[PDB]
Write a protein that binds this ligand. Structure first.
Ligand SMILES: [Mn+2]
Ligand SMILES: [Mn+2]
Lengths: 177, 177
DNA sequence: GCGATCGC
DNA sequence: GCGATCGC
């Protein structure tokens, strides 16, 4: 049971974790770089109160997926692993005498803008936008845009470019509903 | 996680739990009856070693589903709730200095033989038999037999009757795959 | 709406 | 094979 947090506390936790994440790769500790850690979920949406903390980790190679989350390490911080696979890992962390939920997710570099778009939410916004695309025989997820189960090769790198390419109005995370 | 245990230890735990399960229903403690508790999973299949304990609880009315697992009580036993809803609840219990996983599932009375058939497994057996039924435009699950998304009203009460009615060879749980 | 990880 | 719970 993870406790509720203020936005401020959430950001403090992210900043702390940003330089302390690593994973064991066949007996070798590999540091995750700050530039490959993206705060997502309600924190990215700037919500005053948070039910947990959510981080998206950008993994440079498909081969590393079997190693990153299943061998996650956080320097100095007390935590326990509840459910964990290659794409989603739920941790319960200790922060200043209180327990909080920390969700970790992984995206490959080529999935990044789709992952950020997905994990930013909110859920109601995703459902709406995915419903509209579904009516045109598209399927959008955290990995790509598909039509008839085939990847649509969009020439984009950022979340804003993706949203514009999908034909939707760009709004900052704070203002997506 | 939960420790492994022998078939003997599993059966001892089931026998203990059999008279100690209850749930709170709007402030009132309602005992679950032994006759409405069925050991399922690898234990029912008589496997020498078990990764956890699995119980199916038969609930007499649809209205009670929102109350049974979300308010489960076990007299005298130390436990913690991991994930939990109306149909599946995972507990970690303390048994003689060791922690074990206890999975609880619910079936309505009219679902019973379908639930027992499903939760008995093994997984490979279910996939095979469901693949064969799917080719004839049926869908089998823990709730019933369906054709064209409509319940096939089979006149059965037991698991053995169901298997016979589906046209498959009845084998004891020990000998299914 | 869609997918991850889990249940058998 | 099919579904539950939980991620956004
Ligand atoms: Mn989360
Ligand atoms: Mn189990």
């Amino acid at each position: 049971g993870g406790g509720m947090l203020t936005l401020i506390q959430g950001k403090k936790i992210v900043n702390h974790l940003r330089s302390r994440l690593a994973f064991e790769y066949n007996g070798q500790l590999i540091k995750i770089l700050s530039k490959n850690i993206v705060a997502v979920g309600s924190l990215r949406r700037e919500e005053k109160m948070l039910n947990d903390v959510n981080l998206l980790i950008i993994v440079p190679e498909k081969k590393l997926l079997k190693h990153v989350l299943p061998n996650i390490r956080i320097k100095g911080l007390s935590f326990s692993v509840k459910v964990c696979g290659e794409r989603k890992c739920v941790l319960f962390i200790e922060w200043e005498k209180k327990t909080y939920q920390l969700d970790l997710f992984t995206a490959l570099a080529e999935e990044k803008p789709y992952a950020i778009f997905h994990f930013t939410g909110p859920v109601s916004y995703l459902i709406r936008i995915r419903a509209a695309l579904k009516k045109k025989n598209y399927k959008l997820n955290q990995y790509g845009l598909f039509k008839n189960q085939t990847l649509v090769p969009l020439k984009i790198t950022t979340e804003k470019e993706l949203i514009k390419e999908l034909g939707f109005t760009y709004r900052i995370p704070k203002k997506r509903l």
